[PDB]
Amino acid sequence: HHHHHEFMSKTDYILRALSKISHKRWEHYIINRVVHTLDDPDIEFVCQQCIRKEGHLGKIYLADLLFPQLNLYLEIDEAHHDSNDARKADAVRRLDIVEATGFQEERIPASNITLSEVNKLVDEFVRLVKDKKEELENQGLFFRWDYDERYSAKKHINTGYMAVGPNSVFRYHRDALQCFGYRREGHHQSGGWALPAEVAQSIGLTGRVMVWFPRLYEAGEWKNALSADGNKITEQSLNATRNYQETWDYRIVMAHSRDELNRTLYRFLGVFAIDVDKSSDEVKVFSRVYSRVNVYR
C-alpha cells in the first residue's frame, strides 16, 4: 500500500523542512519555533518559497514560511536582499515560483532584536495562524493537509476550478489532464493535449483549447522563455520544418518546473493566447488571458 509515484514521505518532508540550512541569523530559529509551538499537523507549511506579489511586476520575493490553506506567508526581513539573490536566481531557473495572489503578508524584522522580542513576535504570528484556521473551519472552508494528494487532480476536481497559486501544481501530465476530461489509464508524454469540444465549452472557454506543457528555456529545437512578470511566453523554433501557424484559441499552460531535489513538476501559469501582431512564423508570443480556469466536472 505504498505510493508508487512518491519520492518523499510526509514525515521526511517535515524533518528536512525544519532542519534546512540557512544564512539568515534568525530564520532556522523562527521557523522551528513557529512550527513546533503551532503543533498542528493538519496545517500545511512550505519553507523558503520564492513568490510573486500582485502588482510588483517582474519582482521576486522570498517567503520564509508560506501557508497554502490560509492565504498567508511570513517574511523574516533581512536588511540585505542582495545575498538572497542566489537562491532567487536558482528558483527562477527551476521555475520554483508561487504567484501569491491573494495572500496576506506578515513580517518579522530579522535585525536589531532580542531573543525575547523574537519569541514575542512569533507567538503573535502563531496565534494569527491559528485564528485564520478557525475563521475558516468556522465557515466550513478548511481542508486538512492531504500530503499524499498534493500533486494530483483531486483537490481541483473537488473545488471546480483552479488558479495560479501554491496548489495548482501537478506531478505528471496526466494529473493535469484529468482536470480536463482525460479519462485514459495511461500516461501522456507529448507537449500538448487537445480538449474535446464538450469540455472546452463546459469549463467556459470558446473555440479550440489545448493544454500545453512547455519547457520555458532553450531545449531541443525550441528556444522558449517566460517574461519577468510571468505574463508573456515567447517561442522560438530552431528548426524550419517545425515552423507552424497557431491554430489554438487558448492554451492552458502547465509549465515544466523543478523542485529543490530537481524532480519535475508542472506548474499552472494560467490561460494564454497568441498575440498575432507580435508574432511570426518563427517566433510566437503568447500573452496571458486568465490566471484561473474551471475544472471539468
Author numbering: -6 to 290
From the primary publication:
The endonuclease PvuRts1I from Proteus vulgaris (strain) has been reported to be a dimer like most endonucleases that catalyze double strand breaks. The structure reveals an N-terminal PD-(D/E)XK domain in agreement with an earlier prediction and a previously unrecognized C-terminal SRA domain.
We therefore conclude that the N-terminal part of the enzyme (residues 1–140) harbors the nuclease activity and henceforth refer to it as the catalytic domain. Therefore, the C-terminal domain of PvuRts1I (residues 141–293) will be referred to as its SRA domain in the following. Interestingly, we see an isolated large peak of electron density close to the expected location of the glucosylhydroxymethyl group in the pocket for the flipped base. In agreement with the biochemical data for the PvuRts1I variant used in this work, we do not find the predicted dimer in the crystal.
